[PDB]
A paper describes a structure:
The enzyme phospho­triesterase (PTE) is capable of hydrolyzing such OP compounds. Accordingly, it has been characterized from a number of bacterial sources, including Brevundimonas diminuta (Bd; formerly Pseudomonas diminuta), Flavobacterium spp. and Agrobacterium radiobacter. The present study focuses on Bd_PTE, a dimeric metallohydrolase that has a (β/α)8 TIM-barrel fold with two Zn2+ ions embedded in the active site. Carbon dioxide reacts with the side chain of Lys169 to form a carbamate functional group within the active site, which serves as a bridging ligand to the α-Zn2+ and β-Zn2+ ions, both of which are required for full catalytic activity. The buried α-Zn2+ ion is ligated to the protein via direct interactions with His55, His57 and Asp301, and the exposed β-Zn2+ ion interacts with His201 and His230.
However, A53_1 is a monomer, with only one Zn2+ ion in the active site. Since the presence of both Zn2+ ions and the correct orientation of the residues in the active site are crucial for maintaining the catalytic activity of PTE, it is reasonable to assume that the A53_1 monomer is catalytically inactive. While almost all of the PTEs in the PDB are seen to crystallize with molecular dimers in the asymmetric unit, A53_1 displays only one molecule in the asymmetric unit. A dimer is formed by applying the crystallographic twofold axis in space group P21212. However, this dimer interface utilizes different residues and is rather loose compared with the canonical non­crystallographic dimer seen in other PTEs, suggesting that it is not a physiological dimer. The two segments, residues 60–79 and 301–313, which are involved in the canonical PTE dimer interface show pronounced conformational differences in the A53_1 structure cartoon shown in Fig. 5. Since some of the residues in the disordered regions are in the vicinity of the active site, it is plausible that their disorder, and the significant conformational changes observed in residues 60–79 and 301–313, as well as the presence of only one Zn2+ ion, preclude the dimerization of the A53_1 structure and eliminate catalytic activity. Indeed, A53_1 occurs as a monomer in solution, as demonstrated by gel filtration (not shown).
Residue numbers in the entry: 36 to 202, 211 to 253, 276 to 313, 321 to 362
The structure:
Amino acid sequence: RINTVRGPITISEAGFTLTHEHICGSSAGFLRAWPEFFGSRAALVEKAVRGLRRARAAGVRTIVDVSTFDAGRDVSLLAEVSRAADVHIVAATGLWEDPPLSMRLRSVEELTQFFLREIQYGIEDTGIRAGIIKVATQGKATPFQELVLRAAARASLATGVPVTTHTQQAAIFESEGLSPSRVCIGHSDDTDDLSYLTALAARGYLIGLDSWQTRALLIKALIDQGYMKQILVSNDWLFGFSSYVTNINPDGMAFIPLRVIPFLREKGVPQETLAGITVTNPARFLSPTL
Ligand SMILES: [Zn+2]
């Protein structure tokens, strides 16, 4: 069973899953400070529900929202849009690029307990539990970033909930006893080299990407190398979405099933492989595994 914002779900209920999406983010809060310009909360919820119902109509069944407490996560909003659009949503714990003072001073043991609190107890006073750990990294490795990755690895070891991060790191995860099949390492264009992707893929890590046709061909290259079981999919292939710039692109959150899947079909990626990367791989990733 996977923790969603409306409660636990079985593996088989997850279906077609996007694994690194952005409903919540930095900018939604300013609707509280300035609704005259940005619109009401109800209008934001309405825009989000409409976009998710279109993604649902195109075939998306589950999305993983990777916003964290320090990057604008709003799990009560996620639960409302999940119910209205009939799309499962997995919430994340973790930390973003530049966390507050009060978090930058914590030990690995303390940060582990923070992540575990949001996985085992709930987020804030909502009772909604996170189903993934997101660790956003800036650039140059720093001791605090290594500390956060270690805390995430330990929370994953305790609960079996997967970790998703950005580009070394693999030695830290293995340092802590965590199987690579619990970790998705996301790569940007500056780290897109197919050689690096296959290297991490051969060691058991899941691979994410954060033009879109050239990203899709990188995916095909990875498949052609035999690594289809290590691939996760996300609307991030179109554009580097984040808490800075959320998913709410004339295809909206339906971009993957309406544009990328037909294109991969045109390039000859077979049906069983496409079902593997959109259904089997994310279900195996999200399913808590010790
Ligand atoms: Zn993303």
